[PDB]
């Protein structure tokens, strides 16, 4: 039983957006939809509710003529319109199930981030990290993914294949720039004798680059 | 009371 | 003015019985409300339904060591042998139909702090500028801070003996497995970083200081 949200929205202030909420091996129009939003700090403030058989919505107060909640059987999908963004709209927001009978949220979407800003849309520089001053069995890689937005951006090493000892740290954040790094502990066998690279796509700005490791 | 259908 | 009352914040101790106060509103004493769990980068988790005489209906995958309890408008959620795993954002909601409108409330949430936890130390991987971005006459040293429990730290660096502010950003903490990591970076012209003897990540965390230092040389 799943709630398969939209991916990460990048909207202008004084846009609006549209997410979607897909029902997976449940019956779609047997539950109703309630969308959240994820409070700044902690806690969660309910937005509304579709119920799909009876095309029924009501809202929180604060969301009438700010959320728009529609339900498509057709594609057992879910959409939330949000009008005129402001940053105070960037969050996460969920999609919920609930039974018509009782007021548990039983199973939750993974959640839609929506950034609202007016910040320049930058492809990330990716530089790749040899091992610190080398020698050893064992060998630390790095990659620097410098200077982008929005989030987010997908690293993976050789493509998902080098799936072990990999760490990615979180993202700093600066002047609506991000910058993270990753790195992956790989056998003096493997590397350099095998290319190694970090992979970084960046769907807002359309760019994928994979960046070998090289030795010095 | 507590309403509890939507 | 269907209204849910919680305590910003809550601390127990590893092992001990924890109690949490959701409080309806008077005029709403008598509702159900439902429990949730939320974890940071997950979805909120459903906990249980909770009705005015005690009675309870858990959701799946959550632990015996967790019941639900009532008394007048006061709505309890009790967890035994407290873990690491059950530190969260514990939130009750309550539904109603009010001038003819379904709504559902959240109160604010009780952040639940599992104290005595043994902590972990970070350890660090630092990496220098690589030869590619120097030639852009920009040098950024990365601080990669690894396994460290519980979640606040502070970050310097230094040149030679001497801290630098200026190009210094430092991540909030991500939970990773039951320990958190964290990156700072340093940015420097390529002539900064070729004019110092040495440059210092230090990591201040539960009163250790965990240092890694770079060399041009
Ligand atoms: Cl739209
Ligand atoms: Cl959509
Ligand atoms: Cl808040
Ligand atoms: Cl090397
Ligand atoms: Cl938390
Ligand atoms: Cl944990
Ligand atoms: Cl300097």
């Given at each position: 039983v799943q709630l398969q949200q939209s991916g990460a929205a990048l909207v202008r202030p004084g846009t609006s957006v549209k997410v979607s909420c897909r029902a997976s091996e449940y019956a779609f129009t047997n539950y109703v939809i309630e969308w959240v939003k994820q409070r700044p700090g902690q806690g969660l403030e309910w937005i509304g509710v579709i119920n799909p058989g009876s095309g029924g919505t009501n809202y929180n107060e604060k969301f009438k003529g700010k959320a728009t909640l529609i339900a498509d059987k057709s594609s057992s999908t879910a959409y939330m319109q949000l009008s005129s963004?402001?940053?105070?709209?960037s969050a996460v927001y969920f999609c919920a199930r609930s039974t018509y009978y009782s007021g548990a949220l039983d199973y939750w979407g993974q959640g839609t981030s929506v950034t609202v800003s007016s910040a320049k849309t930058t492809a990330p520089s990716v530089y790749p990290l040899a091992p610190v001053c080398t020698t050893g069995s064992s060998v630390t890689l790095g990659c620097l993914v410098k200077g982008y937005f929005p989030e987010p951006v997908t690293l993976t090493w050789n493509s998902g294949s080098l799936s072990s000892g990999v760490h990615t740290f979180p993202a700093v954040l600066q002047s609506d720039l991000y910058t993270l790094s990753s790195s992956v502990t790989v056998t003096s066998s493997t590397w350099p004798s095998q290319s190694i690279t970090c992979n970084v796509a960046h769907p807002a700005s359309s760019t994928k680059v994979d960046k070998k490791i090289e030795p010095r | 009371v507590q309403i509890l259908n939507k | 003015q269907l209204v849910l009352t919680q305590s910003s914040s809550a601390s127990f101790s590893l092992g001990a019985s924890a109690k949490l106060t959701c409080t309806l509103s008077s005029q709403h004493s008598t509702y159900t409300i439902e429990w949730y769990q939320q974890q940071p980068l997950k979805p909120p988790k459903y906990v249980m339904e909770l009705k005015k005489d005690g009675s309870h209906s858990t959701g799946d995958g959550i632990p015996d060591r967790f019941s639900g309890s009532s008394s007048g408008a006061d709505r309890y959620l009790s967890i035994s042998n407290?873990?690491?795993?059950?530190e969260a954002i514990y939130i009750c909601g309550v539904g109603d139909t009010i001038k003819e409108q379904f709504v559902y409330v959240f109160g604010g949430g009780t952040k639940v702090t599992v104290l005595g936890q043994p902590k972990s130390t970070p350890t660090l991987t630092v990496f220098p500028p690589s030869s590619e971005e120097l030639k852009e006459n920009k040098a950024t040293l990365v601080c990669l801070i690894s396994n460290?429990?519980?979640s606040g730290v502070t970050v310097a660096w230094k040149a030679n003996g001497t801290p630098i502010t200026q190009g210094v950003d430092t991540s909030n903490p991500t939970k990773e497995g039951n320990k958190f990591m964290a990156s700072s970076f340093l940015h420097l012209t390529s002539d900064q970083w070729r004019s110092h003897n040495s440059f210092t990540c230090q990591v201040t965390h539960e009163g250790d200081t965990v240092e890694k230092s770079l060399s041009p040389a």
């Open positions: 963004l402001t940053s105070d709209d | - | 407290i873990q690491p795993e059950d460290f429990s519980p």
